[PDB]
Amino acid sequence: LKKYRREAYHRVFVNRSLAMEKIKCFGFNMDYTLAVYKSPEYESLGFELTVERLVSIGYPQELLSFAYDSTFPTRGLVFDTLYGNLLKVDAYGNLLVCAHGFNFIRGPETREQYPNKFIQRDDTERFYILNTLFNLPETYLLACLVDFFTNCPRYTSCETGFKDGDLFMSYRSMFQDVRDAVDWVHYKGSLKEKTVENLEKYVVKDGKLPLLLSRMKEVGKVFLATNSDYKYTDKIMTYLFDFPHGPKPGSSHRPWQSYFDLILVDARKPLFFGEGTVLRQVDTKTGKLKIGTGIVYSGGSSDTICDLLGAKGKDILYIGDHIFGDILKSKKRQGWRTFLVIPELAQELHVWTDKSSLFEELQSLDIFLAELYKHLDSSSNERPDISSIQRRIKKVTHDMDMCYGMMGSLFRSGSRQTLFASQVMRYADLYAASFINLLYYPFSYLFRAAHVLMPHESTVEHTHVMESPLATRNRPLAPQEITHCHDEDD
Amino acid sequence: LKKYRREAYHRVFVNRSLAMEKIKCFGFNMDYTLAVYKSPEYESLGFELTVERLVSIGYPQELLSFAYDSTFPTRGLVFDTLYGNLLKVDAYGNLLVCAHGFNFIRGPETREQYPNKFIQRDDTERFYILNTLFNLPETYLLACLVDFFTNCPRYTSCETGFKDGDLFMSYRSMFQDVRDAVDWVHYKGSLKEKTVENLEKYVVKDGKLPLLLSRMKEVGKVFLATNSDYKYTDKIMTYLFDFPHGPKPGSSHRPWQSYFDLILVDARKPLFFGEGTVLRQVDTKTGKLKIGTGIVYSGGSSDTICDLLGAKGKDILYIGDHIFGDILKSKKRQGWRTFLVIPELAQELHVWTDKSSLFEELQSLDIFLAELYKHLDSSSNERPDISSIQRRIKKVTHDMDMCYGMMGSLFRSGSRQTLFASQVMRYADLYAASFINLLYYPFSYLFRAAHVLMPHESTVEHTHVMESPLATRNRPLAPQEITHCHDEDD
Amino acid sequence: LKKYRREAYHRVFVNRSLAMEKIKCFGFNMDYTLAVYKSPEYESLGFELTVERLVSIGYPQELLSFAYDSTFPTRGLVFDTLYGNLLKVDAYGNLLVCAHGFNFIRGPETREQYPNKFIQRDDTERFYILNTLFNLPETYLLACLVDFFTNCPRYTSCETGFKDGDLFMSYRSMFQDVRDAVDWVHYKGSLKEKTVENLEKYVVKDGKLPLLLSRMKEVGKVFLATNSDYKYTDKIMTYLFDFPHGPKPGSSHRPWQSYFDLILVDARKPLFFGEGTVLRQVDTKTGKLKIGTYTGPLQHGIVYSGGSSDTICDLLGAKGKDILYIGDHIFGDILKSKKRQGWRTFLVIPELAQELHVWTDKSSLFEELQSLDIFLAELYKHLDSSSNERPDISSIQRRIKKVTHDMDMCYGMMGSLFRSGSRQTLFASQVMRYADLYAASFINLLYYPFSYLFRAAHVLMPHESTVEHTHVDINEMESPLATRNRTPQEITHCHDEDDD
Amino acid sequence: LKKYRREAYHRVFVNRSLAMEKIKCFGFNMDYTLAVYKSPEYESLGFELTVERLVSIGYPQELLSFAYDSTFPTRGLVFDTLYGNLLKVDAYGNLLVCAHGFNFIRGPETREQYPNKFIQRDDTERFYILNTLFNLPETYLLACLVDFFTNCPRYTSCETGFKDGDLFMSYRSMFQDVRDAVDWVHYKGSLKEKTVENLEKYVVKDGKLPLLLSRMKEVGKVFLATNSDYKYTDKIMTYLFDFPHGPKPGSSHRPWQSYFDLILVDARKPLFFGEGTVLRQVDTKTGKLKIGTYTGPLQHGIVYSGGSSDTICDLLGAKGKDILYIGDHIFGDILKSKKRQGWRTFLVIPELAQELHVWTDKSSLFEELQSLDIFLAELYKHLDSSSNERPDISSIQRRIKKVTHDMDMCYGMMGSLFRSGSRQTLFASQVMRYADLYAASFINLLYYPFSYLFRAAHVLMPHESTVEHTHVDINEMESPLATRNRTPQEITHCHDEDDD
């Protein structure tokens, strides 16, 4: 008899144990959480507006000929502003994939610029990490620009940039313009305007969303905290809740503000989680602001929101798409529980199941490889020919990589977890492809964390078998109750 | 048909893939690698000499009544110099176990001093991490002192220390004396003297050791790099190789220096891995030193040793018990491959197999718990009574913790990996209970890394199953060859 | 005899020696350098627009009753975002003046929040230094807000902020809104619009400016480097050169661009001094940009955008040694931390005009403080460690305190920009670090030849300034506790000559 | 008239004002404070033992031919472990003197390794500052080693070290062996043994020391805080008080312990000023330690071990305000960075004895430099930006360089401890930061009453020292580019009076 689990595309995955019965408040991000933007239409829109901004700022007209390719970028890549490389790294800074423009650099060639295949993530001045879903157009745009100036006769390829005659143009300064142009497109309203004049093309609409939020408000409180203003929030949220019937069958429609006990616009994260700004009330009918204490607020801080709701830290589950540093934990008051929305998880779960032949063949090659060394020890002079097997492993592994995209899986490359995956294991108590998967779990559910096995755990059976004394080293009242309570959330 | 694996207590576990055929040099630490000290006799000896040093420095005579208890300490604990706590933390600074003296603090009581059950490891001034095998006596000694002054009428318990009348004594200043006393015991020769006057009581002796080192020297080079001087190294290494016969059956004995192409004493690690000191030759027959370039050297640096052997970075496998920071990788030349000796792995593998009933019962409780929620979703008002099941899970989990010791497993507490385990996954390419497990592997073996599965990988079958558009988001030449080569070591 | 010196209000003061003969390129900032803004008119304009912006985003209407008081703020104050205090500190972080709102905290009361009368300047999370001339309205606004919320009964005063009912408003959060509002005023054109629509009210004009710049271009190159766009620069620069003549009266007028070899707008300082942005040449006829440099006929233009200080060096064909950069801003140790040669610096400190007036027209106060100090030494004369006397000095100290306070108020409520009492301010030490030369205005260079050798004045330590170069005949032998019983052919340094 | 001042060699110089009347506790370091070591005898003893230690661990025999040269090192030099240079820098990291071995690098050649003539002092991995008097032999040894390996043909000179055949020896690695050897000399008793076996040769004795300390204990408390053990302290202190009389001649001798209220050995500075170690009272009769304080009859002892500065404050019942700590070491911003009140500081700078002699007995050199500077101003008199003249000053500059170099050599090969030319050294700025008072020796306090008010001297900026307090009548109006067209009741600071 095996353990029961819900369907794979309906599950909420557990990183740290969480008792849902103790949750009193449900907090939501808006962008890419409640308002899931259609891929790759939204990435293509941000890509176009950023290219237009760069062209209107002095960049050549050939950039207008670029088109966003959703098959290339993968979230969490590191851009080397010194050499103009997009880097896929592991949890400790080791290099997994290195792309200069559109050319993927092989192993021995990589050691010319990275002698130990290692980068220091601390070097924030040199390395820029593209972790957000808004960074997806920026990720592909950086590759197009490095590719363009590298294969352009008017420019001269160099180690740290390009030459336009007797004038040098570094990757760092070029990266600055791309950074300023993306900030411009987002903070000038160019992207917001094109979005709210065509919600059906860019914003996903689902009736499951008002159903889950209504059930959350029956067992506790629900609040919204978005960096966007109220105007853009009102248009987006009205679209997300525009249905002829209400949540329950046969019921009538009610405004989206009815599902929230507290609505907070202009959050200004991540400053929001520290001191933030002064909290000010918002008059929706007029747009007038007034500091101090309706349900629509502006600015403030996460602690001010925590106090207005009468909740405490661990009573809140914050649901969003963003990964934040250990700045909320460093506070002297309790931090929130986290639910990380990872939209890529939908396509990655399809590869995990609908490509079983690639996984099964990969395991068969490893069993066959282990048989060739089955009879060998430190006295064996033999060297079994594995060139044919390894060459087949690399082909199958690469075919699996291309199932996710040119940059491979978001969570791993081969046997190594990516830097992004380790940041998920750090920040997210729970994670899924969408917050809507909570609809398939009771509000009294006990989310239990799955053990993450080390090599000496996953490759050793619990079955019972002289041992060398070099390993055994020749081999206060004890507690009677459990010394830890991080698996029951009690 | 299942994959073949060698016996569990003979295996070398693979963190990152390593092709042994490419290794040309084998580097060895001496302490706790070649010279494995008998437990708990060696920890008890260092505990006694440190207590005597503290008593001879002004500490009360009651400390002489303490005896080292091997069942209490576990390597990798964090000592909070502000509150005098031994802390077992995870990879991200979250608290798992908290002990003040010998009293284990429960959950809600811990949040008084740690509001988010979180510490900042960056605070090196406040938090001291006890990662070495030499820190084991120090770990238990800190608990004895906190326990002693807490339950002593002559002193007054406080938050950050104790009161001896109108005089305050903080945990930080007390920790300083323990730190200075351990340095004194090691660097005064008190521990070295008691060791070399009774090698059979404190040092493990094994004939497998000269056999493996001889086979290493037949396929490549072997070097030694120890912080100890030549006098202590000569006595220890002569003991380790004192056998009537040589390595091969019927062969005769030859000196221990014959197994090494280069012997380096006074390494002065970790400075050794940077600029180190000036390399100086050592005359063994006289003890005279001379800077510049026998096989016995003193001081130097890891790059000087790398050049004397004619080897390059990845051609070397450094075998030792110590975990070093990302200082060797930051160099502009290639770093070494690593083999981490973890002596605790011998006892931990026994618990993994000889306690199968505890693991099986723990899995049965989780299957039974999943059945109670099998029919529930976000509409279910029911709250299944799990108080009896959880109370049983905590008892079984605690019984498993006590199998490793009062502080639990070195690698995990419950479902969370310890800070020590994540440092193993970062630094060690390979790890085992001893370097002697290489004797059961051919020098052409391809050590292949085992995938470390995330929750969404280990709890989802590859078997094939409308999906919500909130999760799917309404869904450059591609490379033809593999984009990464960190699984074949090529 | 005595050394000749030019008139005090025409002087250029020298921190480090500089041979003007070797300067082949002259660089200019625009704001508060070439375009000197009227005081206190321009400060009050920024104050109004910033208060207006705060009220539009929810701050109470009582802020509209605030009026900028030019007699309160001194540049270079530190705002403690934890306790809401404006702090005047010395070069090492010691507290000199502490003001909570408009209330000045004195002596023992300061130790409640600052036990050692000391702050850690490195704690940039807590302390914000208001060094720029654009920070002057921001400095006075921060004091107005702290004073208003303290006095207004609608708010309860706490140690680190105020309580508005159940809501706590920290000083740090209030400071954030002030910074956001100041940036909004500058970076939404509201300040630029009011400036260009009344340039006679806000911008100073002087006919000596084209004359001095024309003489600079006769001996070398001249360039402009500003963070403003070309549109605002054109309106400002055309105004500064709007005279019915050229450099000399009677000569023909010529456009302001003719006075420069390179015009760099959108500089993006201080990022300009590192990697900056991609250099793009501006077509003033069209306004369109193009990265790099034009190749056709438009290459004869001199207007560029973005770029970096290294790129401007390459365009001018000038090494950093040969460049004198003239501006009002103090930059950190970055331009010299590189491997490329950094620029020489001329710092514009407009407050020097007023401070030099106090230094000369208030000689009565300086003479009395010296008299009181001479009389103090007389009371302790012929006293040593065996003397039991305790001369009554409380009468003299009260006169010292009274005369010293009257001197401070000659500069304003926060005192002199450079010192408070006998201690130099944090601002004064940063002038010493950054500036090779400094003056109230770059226009004082009009009174020096371009062959002039600016020789640095010695900054004397206490044992140098209070001891004469006279043979001290000691009858009793010097204590061996002090003497420890102790009984190259060419010069090894060259920073006072600058002749490499 | 003129202000009265005590004789220059008896003066105590004042950086920050200090009312001695409020000082209730006097703290003393021992090494180079109470126990002033003979110069250059003690430096040469440390040099020999350090060279001897290096040779015993493999360094070549030619090092035994080295002889300490007291005329070479100046305190406070920076050793560049990358390029093997000794650097004399100013308060901001600008290079003044660069010496590779015994070769002084001048002017343009310095820019090869230091392109902006600048170092980043924060790079403690690369730069090591030799501030202490114990660093004096270490300073000269580093130059000897660089010079030897450069000249010896057995080694090939590289940019960052030397090649001994196929082995590269970096300057950083060589510097590590020097530091290890210096610590080994001090912390293995070899220097203590040679010191105590010949105290007349290495330690200065003066009868004024017990007199001054006895007068201090009449007006307050006196304590000792040293890193040395009690055994070495007893031998040293008994020597310093070994006279056939007490404080005054004709009075009875009494043990040195009678002059103190608290004796703190094994201080573990600078850790002492933070958390330190556990305080333990020493039983001088037995030598055994005991944490805390004795409760029986032994509580009347005054000898303690370890502890912290806060604990010593509590034992003396003294707030940090009331304590004047007298020593030779400069500490960073830590004692005042706490929440507890820090100590006032008296810095002992024994080099002042020699530097004051140069300042007075070499007045001919100062008078000529002033004459040359007056004549330089005369050549440029009546010249402005329109003048095309270029007066010949190369003759005067060579005389300025020659006279300046002769002045530097009066201090030694590395020049004065406090300045090089017109720029203060990095050491001088640290004296300004740390020390409230300073002198060649604490014994100069013998010439001041305990009611004396030490008043800080103004450290004048260029625009204050080169401008008189005289009304400047300007006929032409001041340029509005400089003036910007601009037309509390009690004192707000108290650091010059110190009367809280």
XYZ file of C-alpha atoms in Angstrom, chain A residues 129-476:
348
model
C 20.965 37.706 -10.968
C 17.759 37.655 -13.040
C 15.301 35.912 -10.713
C 11.970 37.584 -11.506
C 9.418 36.767 -14.185
C 9.791 40.370 -15.358
C 13.488 39.591 -15.965
C 12.630 37.043 -18.679
C 12.549 39.636 -21.515
C 15.655 41.259 -20.035
C 17.444 37.892 -19.994
C 16.845 37.249 -23.693
C 17.528 40.890 -24.601
C 21.009 40.685 -23.065
C 21.773 37.658 -25.245
C 20.540 39.440 -28.382
C 22.734 42.486 -27.744
C 25.863 40.444 -26.999
C 25.125 38.384 -30.115
C 24.466 41.475 -32.246
C 27.623 43.453 -31.461
C 29.761 40.292 -31.597
C 28.696 39.460 -35.162
C 28.536 43.025 -36.517
C 31.320 44.283 -38.829
C 30.977 47.870 -37.571
C 32.092 46.732 -34.093
C 35.186 44.905 -32.843
C 34.748 42.025 -30.405
C 36.813 42.334 -27.218
C 37.053 40.520 -23.894
C 35.110 43.099 -21.859
C 33.098 44.854 -24.568
C 33.264 46.202 -28.099
C 35.020 48.901 -30.120
C 33.071 51.406 -32.237
C 36.060 52.833 -34.065
C 38.476 54.339 -31.557
C 35.758 54.207 -28.868
C 35.245 51.377 -26.377
C 31.847 50.137 -25.163
C 31.994 47.760 -22.201
C 29.416 45.127 -21.309
C 28.924 46.831 -17.936
C 27.873 50.139 -19.503
C 25.694 48.311 -22.037
C 24.052 46.362 -19.206
C 23.346 49.699 -17.509
C 21.278 50.912 -20.471
C 19.305 47.655 -20.576
C 18.694 48.009 -16.840
C 17.592 51.639 -17.184
C 15.371 50.807 -20.168
C 13.514 48.019 -18.351
C 12.978 50.314 -15.362
C 11.767 52.950 -17.825
C 9.264 50.647 -19.545
C 7.793 49.509 -16.219
C 7.857 52.819 -14.331
C 6.660 55.031 -17.212
C 3.345 53.201 -17.615
C 4.163 51.981 -21.133
C 3.657 48.346 -20.124
C 0.709 49.099 -17.829
C -1.074 51.018 -20.601
C -0.774 48.257 -23.207
C -1.931 45.740 -20.591
C -5.110 47.504 -19.432
C -6.200 48.265 -23.010
C -6.226 44.533 -23.840
C -6.741 42.444 -20.697
C -7.896 39.351 -22.600
C -4.636 39.152 -24.559
C -2.265 39.504 -21.593
C -4.069 38.562 -18.342
C -5.353 35.097 -17.429
C -8.972 34.904 -16.244
C -10.238 32.075 -14.038
C -13.405 31.503 -12.025
C -11.546 29.296 -9.548
C -9.827 32.412 -8.187
C -12.927 34.067 -6.622
C -13.956 30.664 -5.240
C -10.730 30.090 -3.298
C -10.510 33.664 -1.995
C -14.105 33.510 -0.740
C -13.383 30.322 1.213
C -10.253 31.941 2.649
C -12.332 34.867 3.929
C -14.753 32.436 5.598
C -11.982 30.893 7.731
C -9.878 34.028 8.226
C -8.734 37.324 6.727
C -7.458 38.110 3.227
C -5.312 41.104 2.299
C -3.599 42.385 -0.837
C -0.172 44.053 -0.956
C 1.007 45.258 -4.369
C 3.573 47.807 -5.503
C 1.147 49.001 -8.190
C -1.140 51.977 -7.637
C -4.897 51.718 -7.134
C -5.805 52.715 -10.703
C -3.932 49.786 -12.263
C -5.015 47.496 -9.415
C -8.681 48.417 -9.884
C -8.645 47.633 -13.613
C -6.765 44.344 -13.187
C -8.751 43.092 -10.187
C -12.113 44.046 -11.716
C -11.150 41.984 -14.767
C -10.128 38.991 -12.633
C -13.521 38.995 -10.864
C -15.767 39.904 -13.827
C -18.161 36.956 -13.948
C -21.960 36.852 -14.309
C -22.300 34.590 -11.259
C -20.529 34.752 -7.926
C -18.245 32.098 -6.443
C -20.893 29.611 -5.360
C -23.202 28.157 -8.039
C -26.219 30.331 -8.761
C -24.902 33.173 -6.601
C -24.623 36.748 -7.848
C -21.526 38.842 -8.471
C -20.000 41.180 -5.882
C -17.035 43.568 -6.214
C -13.467 42.351 -5.863
C -12.870 44.596 -2.841
C -15.446 42.493 -0.963
C -12.995 39.566 -0.828
C -10.326 41.584 1.038
C -10.291 42.862 4.611
C -7.368 45.153 3.736
C -6.163 46.433 0.358
C -2.684 47.970 0.248
C -1.383 49.616 -2.910
C 2.019 51.262 -3.457
C 3.630 48.735 -1.122
C 7.168 49.644 -2.282
C 8.703 46.254 -1.582
C 11.259 45.247 -0.371
C 11.446 48.486 1.643
C 7.900 47.523 2.658
C 9.251 44.718 4.856
C 11.502 47.110 6.784
C 10.450 50.603 7.837
C 8.658 51.282 4.539
C 6.871 54.596 4.121
C 4.141 56.298 6.131
C 0.793 54.529 5.861
C -1.880 56.693 4.239
C -5.566 56.051 3.628
C -6.859 56.023 0.048
C -10.213 57.461 -1.022
C -11.136 55.300 -4.011
C -13.937 57.622 -5.145
C -11.544 60.601 -5.342
C -7.944 59.360 -5.321
C -7.031 61.555 -2.343
C -4.322 60.456 0.092
C -4.109 61.199 3.817
C -1.499 59.847 6.220
C -2.807 57.836 9.152
C -6.022 55.899 9.616
C -12.248 52.242 4.330
C -9.971 49.312 3.488
C -7.633 50.766 0.827
C -4.266 51.946 2.162
C -1.053 53.110 0.500
C 2.576 52.687 1.509
C 3.061 51.585 5.092
C 5.051 48.564 6.207
C 4.571 44.839 6.725
C 4.419 45.388 10.496
C 1.763 48.096 10.136
C -0.316 45.711 8.014
C 0.317 42.966 10.569
C -1.060 45.237 13.309
C -4.092 46.546 11.394
C -5.251 42.951 10.839
C -4.711 42.097 14.505
C -2.565 39.160 13.385
C 0.870 37.952 14.436
C 3.768 36.813 12.278
C 3.258 33.066 11.961
C -0.529 33.553 11.708
C -0.039 34.947 8.180
C 0.637 33.084 4.932
C 2.026 35.481 2.324
C 1.377 34.223 -1.214
C 3.499 35.642 -4.009
C 5.954 35.034 -6.824
C 8.939 36.885 -5.331
C 11.876 35.504 -3.349
C 13.111 37.817 -0.593
C 16.331 37.721 1.393
C 16.725 36.918 5.076
C 15.674 40.451 6.016
C 12.226 39.546 7.332
C 13.700 36.866 9.610
C 16.282 39.242 11.115
C 13.474 41.258 12.730
C 12.714 40.964 16.440
C 9.068 40.166 15.630
C 7.686 37.064 13.951
C 7.858 36.810 10.173
C 5.231 35.442 7.828
C 4.860 31.973 6.386
C 5.527 31.878 2.653
C 3.846 30.345 -0.399
C 5.947 30.773 -3.550
C 4.154 30.761 -6.907
C 6.428 29.258 -9.572
C 4.625 29.273 -12.954
C 7.371 27.224 -14.637
C 6.348 24.296 -12.408
C 3.468 23.540 -14.796
C 5.693 22.857 -17.810
C 8.364 21.166 -15.681
C 5.848 18.647 -14.321
C 4.848 17.723 -17.882
C 8.473 16.877 -18.703
C 8.690 14.830 -15.499
C 5.825 12.551 -16.606
C 5.384 12.809 -20.391
C 9.109 12.059 -20.933
C 9.407 8.893 -18.848
C 11.359 7.115 -21.598
C 14.264 9.547 -21.206
C 14.432 9.012 -17.435
C 14.111 5.226 -17.733
C 16.832 5.008 -20.389
C 19.083 7.248 -18.290
C 18.678 4.917 -15.303
C 19.368 1.844 -17.452
C 22.667 3.337 -18.625
C 23.692 3.919 -15.006
C 22.850 0.345 -13.990
C 24.748 -0.956 -17.024
C 27.682 1.305 -16.157
C 27.740 0.015 -12.569
C 27.954 -3.582 -13.821
C 31.208 -2.905 -15.688
C 32.882 -1.881 -12.407
C 31.060 -4.559 -10.386
C 34.133 -6.793 -9.974
C 36.829 -4.107 -9.656
C 38.693 -2.712 -6.641
C 41.930 -0.811 -5.983
C 43.934 -3.813 -7.240
C 42.229 -3.874 -10.653
C 44.469 -2.610 -13.449
C 41.575 -2.859 -15.921
C 40.006 0.228 -17.505
C 36.573 -0.700 -18.891
C 35.648 1.093 -22.111
C 32.800 3.453 -21.184
C 33.187 5.873 -24.111
C 30.113 4.482 -25.870
C 27.948 4.592 -22.734
C 28.982 8.115 -21.718
C 28.411 9.419 -25.248
C 24.875 8.018 -25.015
C 24.302 9.527 -21.559
C 25.239 12.991 -22.833
C 22.778 12.714 -25.725
C 19.868 11.607 -23.523
C 20.705 14.224 -20.884
C 20.819 16.954 -23.538
C 17.492 15.856 -25.027
C 16.000 16.192 -21.543
C 17.525 19.664 -21.149
C 15.964 20.833 -24.423
C 12.561 19.667 -23.161
C 12.664 22.594 -20.719
C 14.389 25.018 -23.080
C 17.781 26.017 -24.410
C 18.864 26.931 -20.864
C 17.448 23.736 -19.358
C 15.393 23.203 -16.240
C 14.745 26.037 -13.810
C 15.585 23.806 -10.837
C 18.555 21.751 -12.034
C 21.141 21.042 -14.708
C 22.085 17.383 -14.579
C 22.646 16.188 -11.016
C 23.177 19.705 -9.602
C 20.458 21.965 -8.235
C 20.485 25.498 -9.609
C 21.055 28.635 -7.558
C 17.343 29.377 -8.003
C 16.280 26.020 -6.541
C 18.351 26.531 -3.386
C 16.712 29.939 -2.960
C 13.323 28.224 -3.194
C 14.335 25.740 -0.484
C 15.412 28.695 1.695
C 12.484 31.101 1.348
C 9.347 29.103 0.497
C 7.524 27.092 3.139
C 5.215 25.891 0.347
C 5.383 26.229 -3.422
C 3.339 25.264 -6.472
C 2.686 26.358 -10.044
C -0.126 28.576 -8.722
C -1.885 29.498 -5.501
C -5.025 27.886 -6.954
C -3.780 24.442 -5.862
C -4.795 25.335 -2.293
C -8.372 24.843 -3.531
C -7.677 21.083 -3.419
C -6.586 21.096 0.244
C -8.660 21.554 3.409
C -7.974 24.552 5.617
C -7.158 22.063 8.408
C -4.570 20.212 6.299
C -1.156 19.458 7.802
C 1.423 20.096 5.088
C 4.343 17.802 5.949
C 7.857 18.362 4.634
C 9.471 15.655 2.522
C 13.000 14.653 3.516
C 15.687 15.825 1.092
C 18.027 12.843 1.029
C 21.804 13.119 0.899
C 23.790 10.682 -1.285
C 24.438 8.389 1.692
C 20.679 8.264 2.406
C 19.166 7.813 -1.065
C 21.667 5.153 -2.218
C 21.612 2.944 0.911
C 18.801 0.548 1.781
C 17.528 0.204 5.344
C 18.184 -3.552 5.079
C 20.717 -4.964 7.529
C 24.024 -6.200 6.112
C 34.904 -6.648 10.283
C 34.633 -2.900 9.731
C 37.905 -0.989 9.610
C 38.784 0.830 12.863
C 39.905 3.783 10.719
C 36.180 4.457 10.197
C 34.755 3.450 13.595
C 37.396 5.204 15.757
C 37.538 1.928 17.730
C 33.983 1.911 19.065
C 23.928 15.222 31.813
